[PDB]
Each structure stands twice: as C-alpha cells, then as structure tokens.
Amino acid sequence: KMSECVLGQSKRVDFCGKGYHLMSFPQSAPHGVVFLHVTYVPAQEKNF
Amino acid sequence: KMSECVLGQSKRVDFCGKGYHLMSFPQSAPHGVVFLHVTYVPAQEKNF
Numbered sequence: 595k596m597s598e599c600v601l602g603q604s605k606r607v608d609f610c611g612k613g614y615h616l617m618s619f620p621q622s623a624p625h626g627v628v629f630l631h632v633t634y635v636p637a638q639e640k641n642f
Numbered sequence: 643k644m645s646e647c648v649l650g651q652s653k654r655v656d657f658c659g660k661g662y663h664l665m666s667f668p669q670s671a672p673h674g675v676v677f678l679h680v681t682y683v684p685a686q687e688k689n690f
C-alpha cells in the first residue's frame with residue numbers, strides 16, 4: 595500500500611479506501627503505520 | 643477477489659479467470675466461495 599496508494603493512484607477496488615482513489619498520506623504510529631486515504635464519492639443522482 | 647472481480651473490472655492477468663475479464667458472479671459453497679468468471683477470448687485469426 596505504501597507504493598500503490600501513496601506513490602501512485604490505484605484502480606484496485608477497496609484497496610486504498612472506499613470510493614474512487616485520489617491520494618493518500620502516511621502517518622507513523624508506535625508499531626505500525628496509519629494511512630489517510632482521500633477518495634472521490636459521487637452524490638445526488640437523477641434519472642434520465 | 644470479491645472486491646476486485648465482482649465489484650469491478652480488473653486488468654490483473656489471470657486474477658479473475660483465463661482470458662480478458664468481463665465480469666464475475668459469486669456463488670456460496672459450504673465453508674467457501676465459488677467465482678463464475680466471464681472472460682473474452684478472441685478466435686479465428688487471419689494474417690496480414
């Protein structure tokens with residue numbers, strides 16, 4: 595995920611958050627890593 | 643695979659069946675899952 599979510603834009607479904615992946619930012623944690631995932635989500639549909 | 647083969651279209655080779663991935667349908671099995679992989683296979687080539 596560090597390579598595919600932070601150093602790129604992934605198309606893999608539900609791999610870099612929920613929605614359409616735009617970008618991610620890492621944060622360190624005591625014995626691990628926290629990813630902040632920024633996604634695009636559509637809203638307010640109409641029928642045509 | 644449930645995320646990437648069923649909830650979307652994958653470009654990963656051989657991850658969602660043999661051929662060019664179109665779509666997949668899940669089925670429940672006892673203690674497991676069965677994937678029905680729908681693929682696109684070209685046929686009847688000519689040379690040019």
Ligand SMILES: *[C@@H]1O[C@H](CO)[C@@H](O[C@@H]2O[C@H](CO)[C@@H](O)[C@H](O)[C@H]2NC(C)=O)[C@H](O)[C@H]1NC(C)=O
Nearest residue numbers: 660661662681682683684685686687688689690
């Ligand atoms: C396209 O042309 C090639 C030859 O350039 C065909 O390959 C030949 O196929 C025949 C019959 O199977 C063999 O006897 C030859 O040995 C093959 N040639 C070579 C050099 O391998 C090929 O069959 C053609 N493709 C189509 C779809 O007709």
